[PDB]
Each structure stands twice: as structure tokens, then as C-alpha cells.
């Protein structure tokens, strides 16, 4: 911005960018570029991923058990599961951010391949190319 800027409205931060803000706030490693992790970092990410996936499973189970007894679930009844699913997003993004890997760039490539694959007969369309996550990591290593 400069003296010519009369309005400066940014696009909302992405969920991946939010993880960077969180790790900066708590003093956790959050490298700009792909960075081989110490084993202690890998162990933590594993622990948080296990913790979060167990909580998601417990809420899905609770919903199935209630549903079975003639409780027909309501929308508000989805709130704990939604919270746990968001926590699982949070620690999945969190692992990518601590690896210095732009999760949006990797996701975009996975989405490109998946969305392209949906144009096939699920079978692949002609000329389909799978997600090249290795290429994304390489290009992230050379970014501005």
C-alpha cells in the first residue's frame, strides 16, 4: 500500500494460513518452506492426529447409537461431531504447517486430480494425470 490506497480489504485468511498464525502465537515451529522435521515433531503430529481421530470416532459412534434407538438426529445434534471434525482439520493442517508445506498448494493439486478424475466414466478420463505432490513440494522449496 501507499498514499494512493483508499481501501485495503483483504480476502479472508485460509484455514492453512490460520494454522501459521496459531503456531506463531504459541511459539511452535512454522517454517516458510518445506523443512525436514526432527523426530520429536513427527511424534507430536502423530499424537495429535491420533487424539483427534479418536474423538471423531467417538462422536460418530454416539450419533449411530442414538439414531438406532429411535432418536432421529437433529441438526444441533451434529455440533459435537462438527467440532471434532474441525479439530481433525486443525491438526492435519497443523502437521503440514510445521513441515513448512503450504497446505493450500498441496490440496489444490489433490483437488485438481480428483476433480479431473470425476470427468471420467469411478474411471479415469483420457489424459488424466494423478496428483504430483512431489512437484508441489519442489516448487514450494523455490518460492519467493
Question: Contact with ligand DUP (CB under 6 A): which of 49, 56, 85, 87?
Answer: 87
Minimum distance between the CB of residue 1 and its own copies, rounded to whole angstroms? 18
**Four-point Cα dihedral 137, 139, 142, 144, nearest 10:** -110
User: Is 137 in contact with 34 (CB distance < 8 Å)?
Assistant: yes
Q: How far is CA 28 from CA 21, 38, 60, 64, 94, in A?
A: 10, 13, 31, 37, 10
Q: Which of 42, 63, 110, 133 binds ligand DUP (CB under 6 A)?
A: 110
Stretch that binds ligand DUP, among 61-69, 90-98, 101-109, 135-143 (CB under 6 A): 90-98
- Picked from ligand DUP, its own copies, none, the partner binding residue 81 (CB below 5 to 8 A depending on kind) is its own copies
Find the binding residues for ligand DUP in span 38-77 (CB under 6 A).
48, 51
- Binding ligand DUP (rule: CB under 6 A), the pick from 37, 90, 104, 132 is 90
Which one, of 56, 143, 50, lies nearest residue 100 by Cα?
Answer: 143
Question: Are the C-beta atoms of 124 and 135 separated by less than 8 Å?
Answer: no
Determine which residue in the list 16, 92, 94, 136 makes contact with ligand DUP, applying CB under 6 A.
Answer: 94
**Given 16, 30, 91, 109, the residue binding ligand DUP (CB under 6 A):** 91
DSSP 126: T
Q: For the chain, how many helices (H) and strands (E)?
A: 5, 0
Report yes or no: 137 and 33 within 8 Å, Cβ to Cβ. Answer: no
Residue among 1, 40, 122, 144 that touches ligand DUP (CB under 6 A): 122
| 17 contacts ligand DUP (rule: CB under 6 A) | no
The residue to which cell 434407538 is assigned: 69
Given the rule CB under 6 A, which residues bind ligand DUP?
48, 51, 87, 90-91, 94, 110, 114, 122
Amino acid at each position: 500500500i501507499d498514499p494512493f490506497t483508499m481501501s485495503d480489504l483483504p480476502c479472508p485468511p485460509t484455514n492453512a494460513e490460520r494454522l501459521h498464525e496459531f503456531h506463531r502465537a504459541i511459539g511452535a515451529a512454522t517454517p516458510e518452506r518445506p523443512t525436514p522435521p526432527p523426530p520429536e515433531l513427527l511424534r507430536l503430529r502423530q499424537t495429535l492426529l491420533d487424539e483427534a481421530s479418536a474423538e471423531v470416532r467417538a462422536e460418530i459412534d454416539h450419533l449411530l447409537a442414538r439414531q438406532a434407538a429411535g432418536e432421529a438426529l437433529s441438526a444441533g445434534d451434529l455440533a459435537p461431531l462438527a467440532h471434532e471434525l474441525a479439530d481433525l482439520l486443525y491438526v492435519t493442517y497443523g502437521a503440514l504447517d510445521q513441515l513448512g508445506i503450504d497446505a493450500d498448494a498441496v490440496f489444490a493439486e489433490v483437488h485438481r486430480a480428483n476433480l479431473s478424475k470425476a470427468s471420467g466414466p469411478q474411471l479415469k478420463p483420457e489424459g488424466w494425470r494423478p496428483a504430483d505432490v512431489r512437484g508441489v513440494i519442489e516448487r514450494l522449496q523455490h518460492a519467493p
